[PDB]
Amino acid sequence: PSLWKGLVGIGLFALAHAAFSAAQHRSYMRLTEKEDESLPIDIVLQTLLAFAVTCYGIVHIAGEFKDMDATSELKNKTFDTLRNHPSFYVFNHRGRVLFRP
């Protein structure tokens, strides 16, 4: 369904928010200068979950596969279509006379 597309959007948004959080946390260190050297569990969990949902949505957004066997889409092609030959059309048929000229 189309909602899949919407899903991926929020995923990116989630990732974007993670970035902001990470940036802020970096400022934290740039003002604390302590031996933490570790991201908050909340931000990494949020980033990983956003990655998972965004990838799952993207896989759907990629599209639908197509079968290799050439007789798949040609199965429904009745003989009433392949014979038309659009380049070799002739307009000397009963259609013109029968219909309004």
Partner: peptide
């Protein structure tokens, strides 16, 4: 049986699109 070039090309294209998108997203996450 009888492979059709257009369908296999489309499958390769969709696989490549998915791979590129996932790799870019993984780079962003890392």
């Amino acid at each position: 049986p009888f492979i059709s070039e257009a369908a296999v090309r489309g499958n390769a294209a969709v696989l490549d699109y998915c791979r590129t998108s996932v790799s870019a997203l993984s780079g962003a996450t890392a």
